[PDB]
Scaffold this active site. Sequence first.
Site, mmCIF file in Angstrom:
data_model
loop_
_atom_site.group_PDB
_atom_site.id
_atom_site.type_symbol
_atom_site.label_atom_id
_atom_site.label_comp_id
_atom_site.label_asym_id
_atom_site.label_seq_id
_atom_site.Cartn_x
_atom_site.Cartn_y
_atom_site.Cartn_z
ATOM 1 N NE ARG A 18 -2.040 -1.644 3.401
ATOM 2 C CZ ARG A 18 -2.458 -1.770 4.659
ATOM 3 N NH1 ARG A 18 -3.735 -1.576 4.977
ATOM 4 N NH2 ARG A 18 -1.589 -2.104 5.607
ATOM 5 C CG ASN A 36 -4.008 -4.654 2.217
ATOM 6 O OD1 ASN A 36 -3.511 -4.422 1.114
ATOM 7 N ND2 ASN A 36 -3.273 -4.853 3.301
#
Length: 90
Positions: A18, A36
Amino acid sequence: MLQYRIIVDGRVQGVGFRYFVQMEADKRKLAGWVKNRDDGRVEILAEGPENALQSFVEAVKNGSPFSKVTDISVTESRSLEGHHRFSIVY
């Protein structure tokens, strides 16, 4: 501009993915988010100019340290939500 919806699969969680996607998106001045999924995949919404978006997709494939991208699906739309900033979202 254009909006891409990108879903990434592989070894792509718990690997700083991320953060990596966010750095690439900010570098490329793209707006949207990375998140996620509870099934192991990573969702990315990115909005910006076509040159930035295309080069972003290629960068994403390279991944973060210890990641392995096994698949990237991309769908597109001319309809942008007018996002500013690129966030890691929950």
